[PDB]
Swiss-Prot record:
Cellular component terms per the entry's GO annotation: cytoplasm; microtubule
InterPro entries associated with the record: EF-hand-dom_pair, TPP/p25
PANTHER family: P25 ALPHA-RELATED, TUBULIN POLYMERIZATION-PROMOTING PROTEIN FAMILY MEMBER 3
Tissue distribution: Expressed in endometrium during the mid-secretory phase (LH + 7) (at protein level).
Domain of life: Eukaryota
Keywords: Acetylation, Cytoplasm, Cytoskeleton, Microtubule
Record field: compositional bias (Basic and acidic residues): 134-144
Name of this chain's protein: Tubulin polymerization-promoting protein family member 3
GO molecular function per UniProt: tubulin binding
Signal peptide: none
Length: 178
């Protein structure tokens, strides 16, 4: 419903964790830490279906462009993932709205805030972030790569079997000389 302002509350909670640190980011992306906490605060990572590691895996999968952070589109794509982890078997819409229902409205803090005062953030060398002078996203929002380039998911093999062993000074799997 409404291809733009779909859920609202979910988008609000996204901002809550997105602007965690920098309020000028608006709410375009989210890093692995804030995303990990997002699941924790909303207890989407229940441990029985979705564990901490699995949450980091999803984040490491959907991103694609290396990226310390994922954009809103890939966030709602990640939600579909965790949704199918728990609410699978039901209606696609219900599963998606359900997982969002467990998140929407809350902020990065289970009643009490997380005491983290100890990490030296005094590294203000001006070069750090810098805003005006470093770099901003170039206009490539219209023409992006469908599946990055070659789709690229997993190239996992049985373990590379060599005839009667030996082969070439033992199993030199892409060992420098190839």
């Amino acid at each position: 419903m409404a291809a733009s302002t779909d859920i609202a509350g979910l988008e609000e909670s996204f901002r809550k964790f997105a602007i965690h640190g920098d309020p000028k980011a608006s709410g375009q992306e989210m890093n692995g830490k804030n995303w990990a906490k997002l699941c924790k605060d909303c207890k989407v990572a229940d441990g029985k279906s979705v564990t901490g590691t699995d949450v980091d895996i999803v984040f490491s999968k959907v991103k694609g462009k290396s990226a310390r952070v994922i954009n809103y589109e890939e966030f709602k794509k990640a939600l579909e993932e965790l949704a199918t982890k728990r609410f699978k078997g039901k209606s696609k819409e219900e599963a998606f709205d359900a997982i969002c229902q467990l998140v929407a409205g809350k902020e990065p803090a289970n009643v009490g805030v997380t005491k983290a005062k100890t990490g030296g953030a005094v590294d203000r060398l001006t070069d750090t972030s810098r805003y005006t002078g470093s770099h901003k996203e170039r206009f490539d929002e219209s023409g992006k790569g469908k599946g990055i380039a070659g789709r690229q998911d997993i190239l996992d093999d049985s373990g590379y079997v060599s005839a009667y062993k030996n082969a070439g000074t033992y199993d030199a799997k892409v060992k420098k000389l190839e």
